[PDB]
Ligand binder design. Structure first.
Ligand SMILES: O=C1C[C@H](NC(=O)c2c(Cl)cc(Cl)cc2Cl)C(=O)N1
Ligand SMILES: [Zn+2]
Length: 104
């Protein structure tokens, strides 16, 4: 029902807020360092700290620029916030295995 940061327990998001971007909330992707991420898309999230300036470089989602999303509490890299696109303008792509699911 809710998703917390796996490292410290910070409240991050909810199952109800999963978003099927391109028909699926799950997207498996790699960055230029070859790191594989299983990214779940969410319409909304909280408890994050978004860092740096948005960048389109290597964006996995056409038309969106990303900013890195850290856990606001412990600093763990939890994913990205996506903006500058259309339908929707913004969303979060969070790394599934950095989250823990549990009761509200
Ligand atoms: O949509 C995205 C987000 C994802 N970005 C990254 O992994 C990334 C890059 Cl490329 C550079 C730095 Cl300095 C830090 C990070 Cl976290 C990517 O490659 N495509
Ligand atoms: Zn945390």
């Amino acid at each position: 029902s809710i998703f917390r940061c796996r490292q410290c327990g910070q409240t991050i998001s909810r199952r109800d807020w999963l978003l099927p971007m391109g028909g699926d909330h799950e997207h498996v992707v790699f960055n230029p360092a070859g790191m594989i991420f299983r990214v779940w898309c969410f319409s909304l999230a909280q408890g994050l700290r978004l860092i740096g300036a948005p960048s389109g470089e290597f964006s996995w989602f056409k038309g969106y620029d990303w900013t890195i999303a850290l856990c606001g509490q412990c600093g763990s890299h939890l994913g990205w916030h996506y903006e500058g696109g259309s339908q929707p303008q913004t969303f979060f792509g969070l790394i599934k295995d950095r989250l823990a699911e549990g009761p509200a």
